[PDB]
Amino acid sequence: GSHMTPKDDEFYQQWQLKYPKLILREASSVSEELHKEVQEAFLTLHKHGCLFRDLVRIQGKDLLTPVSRILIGNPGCTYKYLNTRLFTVPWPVKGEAEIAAACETFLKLNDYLQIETIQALEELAAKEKAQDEVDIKSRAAYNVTLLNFMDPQKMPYLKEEPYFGMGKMAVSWHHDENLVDRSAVAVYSYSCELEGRDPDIWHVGFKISWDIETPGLAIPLHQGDCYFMLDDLNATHQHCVLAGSQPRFSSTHRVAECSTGTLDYILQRCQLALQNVCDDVDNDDVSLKSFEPAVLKQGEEIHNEVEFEWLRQFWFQGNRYRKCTDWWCQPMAQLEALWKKMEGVTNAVLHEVKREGLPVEQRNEILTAILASLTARQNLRREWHARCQSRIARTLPADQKPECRPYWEKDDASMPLPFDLTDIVSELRGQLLE
Ligand SMILES: CCc1cc(-c2ccncc2)cc(CC)c1Nc1cccc(CN2CCCOCC2)c1C(=O)O
Numbered sequence: 001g002s003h004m005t006p007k008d009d010e011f012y013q014q015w016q017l018k019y020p021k022l023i024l025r026e027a028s029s030v031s032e033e034l035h036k037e038v039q040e041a042f043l044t045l046h047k048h049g050c051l052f053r054d055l056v057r058i059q060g061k062d063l064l065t066p067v068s069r070i071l072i073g074n075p076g077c078t079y080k081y082l083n084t085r086l087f088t089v090p091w092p093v094k095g096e097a098e099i100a101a102a103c104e105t106f107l108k109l110n111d112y113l114q115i116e117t118i119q120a121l122e123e124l125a126a127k128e129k130a131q132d133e134v135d136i137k138s139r140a141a142y143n144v145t146l147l148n149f150m151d152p153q154k155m156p157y158l159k160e161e162p163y164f165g166m167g168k169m170a171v172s173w174h175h176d177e178n179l180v181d182r183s184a185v186a187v188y189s190y191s192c193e194l195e196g197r198d199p200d201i202w203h204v205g206f207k208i209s210w211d212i213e214t215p216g217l218a219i220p221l222h223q224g225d226c227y228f229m230l231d232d233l234n235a236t237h238q239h240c241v242l243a244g245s246q247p248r249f250s251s252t253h254r255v256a257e258c259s260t261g262t263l264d265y266i267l268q269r270c271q272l273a274l275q276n277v278c279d280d281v282d283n284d285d286v287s288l289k290s291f292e293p294a295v296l297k298q299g300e301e302i303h304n305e306v307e308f309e310w311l312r313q314f315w316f317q318g319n320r321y322r323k324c325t326d327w328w329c330q331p332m333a334q335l336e337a338l339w340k341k342m343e344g345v346t347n348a349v350l351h352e353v354k355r356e357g358l359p360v361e362q363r364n365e366i367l368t369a370i371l372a373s374l375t376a377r378q379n380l381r382r383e384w385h386a387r388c389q390s391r392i393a394r395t396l397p398a399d400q401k402p403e404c405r406p407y408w409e410k411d412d413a414s415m416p417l418p419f420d421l422t423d424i425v426s427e428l429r430g431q432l433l434e
């Protein structure tokens with residue numbers, strides 16, 4: 001296989017005919033005022049220590065990202081990739097001083113790139129000519145930006161790009177997942193300073209999915225260049241980042257698919273679960289209104305959602321955003337208290353199944369409704385505990401140390417149920433086989 005750069009004669013027609021949805025807006029098209037502000041904001045975030053490597057999962061293996069990152073975006077919004085949910089450092093939208101000024105700068109960059117994207121999508125539809133406007137607006141309505149930094153000098157060995165001879169990869173071939181269908185992605189690239197591609201300059205690489213026959217494109221990225229993946233390009237093509245010699249930042253603006261990924265969403269889910277609880281007073285005497293299978297099933301599913309998708313995801317990062325912001329401190333305190341009440345709900349259901357007067361047919365209905373949720377709860381707890389205590393997780397500093405919260409010992413009387421549910425789950429299974 002082979003690749004094409006601006007040095008190759010065929011590069012320009014190949015871009016035109018096979019990559020019409022890839023746009024490059026070079027540094028000269030963007031204002032020098034915006035350049036200075038955005039680049040100063042990158043260095044502020046880096047100096048204050050706001051950028052961290054994510055500990056992600058790829059095919060059962062715990063891996064640090066080669067890039068250090070931070071998610072900036074709408075208040076209460078999240079972005080999930082590689083089984084790792086990032087929580088936004090909020091930018092000042094309608095309705096810490098140096099850090100908040102940088103978050104305001106990246107909102108200003110978001111506003112600019114949104115307008116550039118809309119114009120590019122309007123021109124794309126105009127070219128395709130030779131309901132529509134609402135789709136273009138929503139596909140360019142960037143709700144987050146995920147910032148990136150890498151010093152390639154710090155890495156002892158970078159992987160060779162395997163298919164096209166593109167050289168050293170900073171980031172391997174992938175799609176950006178958890179984005180709205182056909183939504184655009186806009187990237188501001190900030191580099192700090194003759195056979196194939198130039199090894200000292202940063203590039204973004206592109207290939208068609210499933211395809212190593214068709215030669216890939218490697219687009220050089222100089223200081224302040226912007227590139228846009230329009231419409232279905234992100235889905236139909238993989239991209240990689242090829243390393244240059246110097247350090248480089250980027251701001252990758254996305255329309256995150258947050259239908260089950262906002263604070264407002266999960267709080268509303270928690271309140272739905274607690275509709276089955278008598279809510280006169282907050283105490284340990286949790287009594288339930290109904291034991292209808294469907295209501296109990298739902299309750300235990302929400303219990304799992306708030307525990308694994310929100311609490312354990314957040315505390316796995318180890319109060320890391322605490323440096324940049326305290327926006328999630330009270331929400332996470334509230335979600336844990338809501339989760340604690342749902343531990344009382346589970347205990348109340350387990351108390352009901354053991355009651356003497358309950359006929360066995362009603363009992364077995366309840367067991368069938370909750371067993372899948374409790375089984376998954378046991379399995380995910382074991383996974384999350386082991387993920388927190390992995391070799392690579394232990395090597396991180398105290399500021400970035402993963403916590404397995406919530407966690408409690410067998411002797412802890414404040415919690416109604418044990419952390420380990422193995423004996424409870426095996427007993428409930430046994431009862432069904434009676
Ligand atoms: C910011 C990191 C990232 C995000 C996403 C990603 C996935 C889905 N949605 C958004 C982003 C995909 C990749 C490619 C593996 C990356 N890259 C990575 C994420 C974690 C770890 C690594 C490092 N090694 C390197 C040697 C080759 O084996 C693969 C793992 C990479 C990588 O660049 O390869």
Ligand SMILES: O=C(O)CCC(=O)C(=O)O
Nearest residue numbers: 067148171176241250252
């Ligand atoms: O720009 C970067 O270096 C990494 C961001 C990226 O390419 C991605 O996550 O898809």
